[PDB]
Design a protein around this ligand. Structure first.
Ligand SMILES: [Mg+2]
Lengths: 395, 536
């Protein structure tokens, strides 16, 4: 077919990312995976003269995973050929969404020749005993932003029948996936999927937010109150109505932390009154389609983690808590990862975008094991950080 | 013997055009020589005369300054994670090292880029036809050529193992010295059908083959100590090449980066000019030498025996490790000085050292080693649980070595009953950079201290320190500062910060400490008080 012309964003050159070291195993894996694609002619060997490079890796549910994040940042937005048109919004609500890997479709449509250089990737060699094998895509590649939008129409024609055939099963395409949501009974859902599946062959409603609550005490020591006071202070940044004062009054002195203190009506009023507002919606929440989503995850020690997605600070679009009880499968890295993957799918189904994460871990560490547990067709952007006392501030 | 291989298409950096530079007229002698020389390269086909039209030019000297041409050349993609480590080599029965000679001049340069390589002789005007010596492409283009050519002979001889690294072909094969000899013949001829001529002055006997400077004996690869001269006329390029030797050894020889000598290269001029530097320059070479003196060596690798890394805390902020497969037959030994943080922990640094070593292997051997670490399984387990960040070590296994690693102290989860509660706080005027630091207590003690040239963080720390000093083995202490809280919460073993070290020394001496935090400026009891005491 005649290739759709795509071009990098204004004044940005293709990507030039170094490859991470691969295990003598993932390598072998890749090596065969590529030699075939080469035979099928989806890729093609290139030289040292193509200054570009994106890293690849072997995920394993083996699968080739190209970390296109850069080429994607540098790729022209899609908005003329509206990339995954309006976001359903229905998805959020359906009894059951199911995701499909429409991705393999992409390997038909030919990629614009003057753009192929930008997909260059290199399979590493052990001990560096060999020049790397370098290739260049010749078809819409798997993780590219350009891919789906370009193939947007082909897909639309493909589903239209089945969509008009079942006027009420929402289908949202995101990257290589197809989020097919319905409210039909589980069995009667699956059929529809299968019907949708032949065509191609040619549970959000339970999600819930975190209601901040103050403890249930009687043994109120000085710091027990100091604690409460500190939190409710910070909590005001979120709910401007909450106010500690009658509480601070209990603390007035130079009391030993262990001293018990009588919770008087001053505070009795304030706690109960505050407890109310911690459950009443921060009317300021707004999902602005033009702002990025940010996700922050804190480690809670019991194989539990807490996260918040927000565009502007203190305006939490959503908050939550993943508790991956891994009695033996305790690779924090593996957990944090699973956290990461479960949070981005939630956002894809809601805001229709993968948040940008602020990982509580050292780059080095996150960098040496992440791939071992990653199971997704995609990879969100991430920034490493050091969590302050939020662990306490909401757990 | 200019090779018949297809040429790699080179471009100039977009927005740039080839070089144009004047040639400083050389001595009658020098000139008569450059000609003498250029005339035969012209004969060999390596270069060629061209008309005075070609706008571009690059300087020749007689002892080509390609600096400019390179500054405008399409930066290529160097396809290698690094140089190969000798320890990575498996043991082979038969091995030979063919030094492909003149390999650059044999591999032809793309036509449409040759224009740019012109040079004159104070004049005579030539242009290269083959990968130039200093040109930026040379290596990357040569490697690509060398591989395309070996590929054929390689599909044919799966038994043979050819590793290239510049002009040296390590050809190994577990074969009968007879049959190997034959294969090496064959190979040697293939190269010839591609113009790559392999001199007879090769390797034919000596077990200490020098492939990449690694003397490759049958069970022991070694590296002869790198001689590093210091001539009278310390010429620029010399200074550059000097860098090379250092930098090359560096992937074995721990730290040598003549980084401050490199600054001499941050202000380049004529390549033929001599230019020294201060104590920076002079001293750098020495420290490098010390390291370069003592040789190194190890065994080869067995793709059937486990990798074992063993680290040991040989001191403050410096660790050591060895990756071996057989008790006294190790591959790489190594030191790892680091302290990634202004305040770290031994537990924390151990982990860093681990991860360094992990990839380092994955690069060389291709798998993550098994560790033997100076840290008890329960010491780790407590630490990760007591840490806000997520962490992880792989093939962890305890080895009771002499210097061991432990969390020197720990803070209390809950306030100590009957401990004098210290309300702390400090402050300082931004303008004057002077402040006070003191406290108040549940008993009656109440210190305050005048301070010179500090920040409010420094006072907030001074203040924690005081209360630590002026108190007993058990103490509840309380700040209006997350900074100091944080540093301490992280259980810092040592620090760049003396006050933090001071604050740590006390912490290891006390018997129970519980550091708490309260919202500054709220009328929180005791707080409002120390608050006023430190104000002026
Ligand atoms: Mg303060």
């Amino acid at each position: 077919i005649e290739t759709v012309p795509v071009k990098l964003k204004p004044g940005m050159d293709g990507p030039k990312v170094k490859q991470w070291p691969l295990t003598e195993e993932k390598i072998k894996a890749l090596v065969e995976i590529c030699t075939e694609m080469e035979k099928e002619g989806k890729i093609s060997k290139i030289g040292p003269e193509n200054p570009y490079n994106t890293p690849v890796f072997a995920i394993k549910k083996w699968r080739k995973l190209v970390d296109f994040r850069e080429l994607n940042k540098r790729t022209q937005d899609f908005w003329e050929v509206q990339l995954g048109i309006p976001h359903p919004a229905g998805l959020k609500k359906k009894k059951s969404v199911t995701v499909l890997d429409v991705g393999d479709a992409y390997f038909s449509v030919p990629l614009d020749e003057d753009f192929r250089k930008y997909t260059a990737f290199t399979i590493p060699s052990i001990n560096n005993e060999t020049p790397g094998i370098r290739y260049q895509y010749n078809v819409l590649p798997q993780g590219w932003k350009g891919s789906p939008a370009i193939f947007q129409s082909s897909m639309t024609k493909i589903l239209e029948p089945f969509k008009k055939q079942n006027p009420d099963i929402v289908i949202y395409q995101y990257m290589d996936d197809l989020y097919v949501g319905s409210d039909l009974e589980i069995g009667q859902h699956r059929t529809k999927i299968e019907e949708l599946r032949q065509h191609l062959l040619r549970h959000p409603d339970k999600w819930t937010v975190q209601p901040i609550v103050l403890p249930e005490k009687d043994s109120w020591t000085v710091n027990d109150i100091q604690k409460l006071v500190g939190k409710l202070n910070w909590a005001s940044q979120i709910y401007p109505g909450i106010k500690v004062r009658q509480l601070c009054k209990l603390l007035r002195g130079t009391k030993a932390l262990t001293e018990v203190i009588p919770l008087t009506e001053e505070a009795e009023l304030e706690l109960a009154e505050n407890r109310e507002i911690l459950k009443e919606p921060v009317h300021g929440v707004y999902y602005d389609p033009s702002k990025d989503l940010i996700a922050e995850i804190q480690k809670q020690g019991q194989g539990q983690w807490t996260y918040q997605i927000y565009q502007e600070p203190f305006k939490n679009l959503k908050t939550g808590k993943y508790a991956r009880m891994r009695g033996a499968h305790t690779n924090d890295v593996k957990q944090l990862t699973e956290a990461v993957q479960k949070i981005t799918t939630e956002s894809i189904v809601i805001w229709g975008k993968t948040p940008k994460f602020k990982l509580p871990i050292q780059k080095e560490t996150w960098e040496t094991w992440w791939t071992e547990y990653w199971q997704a067709t995609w990879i969100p952007e991430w920034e490493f950080v050091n969590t302050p006392p939020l662990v306490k501030l909401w757990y | 013997p200019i090779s018949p291989i297809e040429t790699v298409p080179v471009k100039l950096k977009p927005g740039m055009d080839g070089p144009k530079v004047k040639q400083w007229p050389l001595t009658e002698e020098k000139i008569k020589a450059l000609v003498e020389i250029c005339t035969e390269m012209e004969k060999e086909g390596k270069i060629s005369k061209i008309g005075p039209e070609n706008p571009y030019n690059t300087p020749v000297f007689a002892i080509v300054d390609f600096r400019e041409l390179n500054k405008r050349t399409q930066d290529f993609w160097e396809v290698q994670l690094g140089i190969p480590h000798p320890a990575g080599l498996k043991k082979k029965k038969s091995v030979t090292v063919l030094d492909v000679g003149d390999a650059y001049f044999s591999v032809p340069l793309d036509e449409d880029f040759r224009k740019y390589t012109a040079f004159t002789i104070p004049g005579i005007r030539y242009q290269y036809n083959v990968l130039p010596q200093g040109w930026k492409g040379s290596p990357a283009i040569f490697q690509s050529s060398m591989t395309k050519i070996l590929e054929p002979f390689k599909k044919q001889n799966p038994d043979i193992v050819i590793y290239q690294y510049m002009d040296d072909l390590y050809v190994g094969s577990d074969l009968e010295i007879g049959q190997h000899r034959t294969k090496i013949e064959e190979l040697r001829q293939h190269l010839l059908r591609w113009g790559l001529t392999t001199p007879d002055k090769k390797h034919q006997k000596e077990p200490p083959f020098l492939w990449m400077g690694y003397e490759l004996h049958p069970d022991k690869w070694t590296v002869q100590p790198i001689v590093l001269p210091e001539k009278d006329s310390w010429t620029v390029n010399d200074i550059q090449k000097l860098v090379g030797k250092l930098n090359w050894a560096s992937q074995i020889y721990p730290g040598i980066k003549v980084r401050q000598l490199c600054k001499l290269l941050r202000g380049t001029k004529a390549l033929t000019e001599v230019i020294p530097l201060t104590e920076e320059a002079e001293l750098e070479l020495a420290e490098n030498r010390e390291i370069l003196k003592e040789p190194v060596h190890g065994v080869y690798y067995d793709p059937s025996k486990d990798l074992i890394a063993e680290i040991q805390k040989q001191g403050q902020g410096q660790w050591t490790y060895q990756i071996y497969q057989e008790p006294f037959k190790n591959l790489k030994t190594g030191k790892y000085a680091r302290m990634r943080g202004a305040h770290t922990n031994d537990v924390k640094q151990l982990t860093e050292a681990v991860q360094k070593i992990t990839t380092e292997s994955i690069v060389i051997w291709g798998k993550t080693p098994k560790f033997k670490l100076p840290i008890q399984k329960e010491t780790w387990e407590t630490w990760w649980t007591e840490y806000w960040q997520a962490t992880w070590i792989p093939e962890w296994e305890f080895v009771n070595t002499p210097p061991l690693v432990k969390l020197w102290y720990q803070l209390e989860k809950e306030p100590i009953v009957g401990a004098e509660t210290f309300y702390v706080d400090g402050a300082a005027n931004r303008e004057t950079k002077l402040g006070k630091a003191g406290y108040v207590t549940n008993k009656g003690r109440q210190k305050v201290v005048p301070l010179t040239n500090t920040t409010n963080q420094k006072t907030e720390l001074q203040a924690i320190y005081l209360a630590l000093q002026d108190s007993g083995l058990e103490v509840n202490i309380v700040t209006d500062s997350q900074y100091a809280l944080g540093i301490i919460q992280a259980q810092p073993d040592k620090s760049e910060s003396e006050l933090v070290n001071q604050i740590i020394e006390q912490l290891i001496k006390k018997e129970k400490v519980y550091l708490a935090w309260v919202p500054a400026h709220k009328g929180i009891g005791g707080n409002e008080q120390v608050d006023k005491l430190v104000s002026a």
